[PDB]
């Protein structure tokens, strides 16, 4: 994982679940509890999945639910941390960027692996997203989508059309639906 983006969350595991559960964590593989990860490096996904692993154990919550509040979170720290990618922006244009955004946020790492978001417009008040990775992170995707809504201050439902493994990708596919209408026909 990105080393950038893994210290994202060891802030916002802070926000959430306090110093103690963190710190703690962290000892746990070894590492220095204050660590603060650098952009020249990049963190073995097992090592995430290892402190992941011990957040659960210590709050008692699920690891899945963890991700799930993480990738809500994580938006809040996203906006205070790379302002730019909010700046000036609405929910759908947001949403439709990430794709690209993570391609040029991983094009300097060698055998990058990022996740692929490609989204489509399918009604006047609709997108389609599918997220598709290795990495089997459809909960984290998915607090993603919804801290997005909360920080943006507009109101989204989501559908989650279809989830399942092809050729070795992990695939979740969903419908966007807008309160209020955010396309037009050109
Ligand atoms: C400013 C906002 C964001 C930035 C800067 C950003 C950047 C990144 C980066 C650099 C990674 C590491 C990828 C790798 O090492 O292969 C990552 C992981 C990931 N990103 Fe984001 N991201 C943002 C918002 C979002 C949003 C809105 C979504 C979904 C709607 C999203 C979905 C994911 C997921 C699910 C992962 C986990 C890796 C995986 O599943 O393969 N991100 N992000």
């Given at each position: 994982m990105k080393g950038t983006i893994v210290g994202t969350w060891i802030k916002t595991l802070r926000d959430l679940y306090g110093n103690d559960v963190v710190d703690e964590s962290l000892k746990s593989v070894?590492?220095?509890?204050d660590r603060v990860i650098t952009p020249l490096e990049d963190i073995d996904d097992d090592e995430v999945r290892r402190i992941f692993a011990k957040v659960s154990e210590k709050t008692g919550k699920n690891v899945n639910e963890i991700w799930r509040e993480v990738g809500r979170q994580n938006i809040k720290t996203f906006s205070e941390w790379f302002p730019s990618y909010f700046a000036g922006r609405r929910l759908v244009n947001f949403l439709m960027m990430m794709d690209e955004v993570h391609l040029q946020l991983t094009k300097?790492?060698?055998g990058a692996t990022p996740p692929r978001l490609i989204a489509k417009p399918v009604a006047k008040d609709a997108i389609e997203m599918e997220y598709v990775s290795k990495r089997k992170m459809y909960d984290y995707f998915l607090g993603l989508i919804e801290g997005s809504s909360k920080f943006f201050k507009e109101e989204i439902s989501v559908e989650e059309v279809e989830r399942g493994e092809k050729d070795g990708f992990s695939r979740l596919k969903v419908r966007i639906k807008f309160k209020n209408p955010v396309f037009e026909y050109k």
């Open positions: 070894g590492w220095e509890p300097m790492i060698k």
